Amino acid sequence: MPAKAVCVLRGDVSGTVFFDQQDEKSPVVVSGEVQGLTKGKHGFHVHEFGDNTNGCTSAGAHFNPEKQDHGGPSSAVRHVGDLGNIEAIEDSGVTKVSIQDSQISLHGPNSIIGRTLVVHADPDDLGLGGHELSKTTGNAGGRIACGVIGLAKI
Amino acid sequence: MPAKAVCVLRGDVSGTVFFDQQDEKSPVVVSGEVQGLTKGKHGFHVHEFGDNTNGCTSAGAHFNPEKQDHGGPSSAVRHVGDLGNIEAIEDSGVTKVSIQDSQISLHGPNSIIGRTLVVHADPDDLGLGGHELSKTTGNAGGRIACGVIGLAKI
Ligand SMILES: [Zn+2]
Ligand SMILES: [Zn+2]
């Protein structure tokens, strides 16, 4: 039955992101809002741990229960938490989040509940950037905003 | 397999609270510390929602999958999220969290992953106050600190 999750992002950028899933087997629909982003593409990933003891750093790496290399959302090889990029059209504006993903879930082994959503400083190169961080982080640089993913009402 | 959860408080008071569970059948040991509490007892509860969109208010009521009355942790009738009181020995000091509970879990229906740990302004009367509010909130009053319970490493 329908599950909802929510994430309150804070840091250099901020906003609230929602996760909706109709049933166990359906894709997770990501909606909501990120405000204050610099114009351009920003890496948008679910990280392994819901640990905020050391800023966004203690979130660890991208959520990766299948133990794969980094990729884009449509890559054959990807981390479960690989949600690609969100793109700010202009500076200091409000960016709408609109993603549908079949790998992340709000139930089971791929559940993102109690993990961390992280917005990065730089574009995610989808594992195709050719340099050494590309197959782990997408070379998406620093962690500009994060929050723990919580269970939400209705 | 052993599980760990963590919660970083945000509000009038600070602290990091940890949760440990050896098996799915074993109790949860709650550890860590809260800094800055006023002298006396303070309500200490897991609330239903890991929703931080409106501070600690959007967390909903005490986590209560059985829909029972409020109680102390040792009361026969209680909410799953009823962890009683954390007590500050003096003003503006360090309060040790040291709890073992058989009702909260890090797995299954009573899992507190992705929910919210809340510290209240007033003592929890453990459902023994003689009225309806007592049997609902323990009359623990305002929500002075909270954070989402996230998954932790090892
Ligand atoms: Zn990745
Ligand atoms: Zn209660």
Curated annotation (Swiss-Prot), chains A, B:
Co-factor binding comment: Binds 1 copper ion per subunit.
Oligomeric form and interacting partners: Homodimer.
Catalytic function, reaction form: 2 superoxide + 2 H(+) = H2O2 + O2
Name of this chain's protein: Superoxide dismutase [Cu-Zn]
Disulfide bonds: C56-C146
EC top class named in words: oxidoreductase
SUPFAM superfamilies per the UniProt record, alphabetical: Cu,Zn superoxide dismutase-like (SSF49329)
Keyword line: Antioxidant, Copper, Cytoplasm, Disulfide bond, Metal-binding, Oxidoreductase, Zinc
The species this protein was found in: Bombyx mori (Silk moth)
Binding site for Zn(2+): H62, H70, H79, D82
Family: Belongs to the Cu-Zn superoxide dismutase family.
CDD domains associated with the record: Cu-Zn_Superoxide_Dismutase
A matching Pfam family: Sod_Cu
Keyword Disulfide bond included in the entry's annotation: yes
UniProt-listed Enzyme Commission number(s): 1.15.1.1
Subcellular location: Cytoplasm
GO cellular component: cytoplasm
Alphabetical list of Gene3D superfamilies matching this protein: Superoxide dismutase, copper/zinc binding domain (2.60.40.200)
Residues annotated for Cu cation binding in this entry: H45, H47, H62, H120
One of the record's GO molecular function terms: superoxide dismutase activity
Keyword Ribonucleoprotein: no
Role: Destroys radicals which are normally produced within the cells and which are toxic to biological systems.
Cofactor: Cu cation; Zn(2+)
